[PDB]
Amino acid sequence: FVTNDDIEWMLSICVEWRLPEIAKEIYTTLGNIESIANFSLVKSYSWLLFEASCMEGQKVLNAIVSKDDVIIPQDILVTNSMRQTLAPYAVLSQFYDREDWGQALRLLLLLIEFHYLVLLVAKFLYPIFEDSVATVIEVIETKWSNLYETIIEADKSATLLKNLRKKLNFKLCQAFM
């Protein structure tokens, strides 16, 4: 096979004969940034998810589709994908006070579901600097290596202490309210 059609023919024969293990293998061969996007076994999906999260923390058409174009939407019509879509929505909300709070809440929820991500979240909270918010902050503190430290250093351009300080500040703010 070389063309797309060739592959589709193969697949059509795997369907026609019921060879899911074969199709799964062929496809595996095909999978081996744009290529990865096209692909989006369990471990690989997890890795893709992690990468997407890292990209979001760092922060186009594909992202919008996840959240010519109509055809793509039809084709799309998984957990990794949903998470990336959520991250994108959060970033959009951020770009756009209550909205910001909703985004922060979404971020905390994502962190709970999932170290680097947690650090990015803490960084975002510090930058921003009621009961639900406090509860979230608390859960995060309860949840709380080299790559994480590097990310922290890049952000600054000790971490646990800064986090604790931020939490204390938030608590004080809640008390004042």
Binding site: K67, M82, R83, T85, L86, Y89, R106, L109, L110
Partner: peptide
């Protein structure tokens, strides 16, 4: 739908 999948 996208916000129901994020909450899950």
């Amino acid at each position: 739908d996208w916000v129901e999948q994020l909450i899950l």
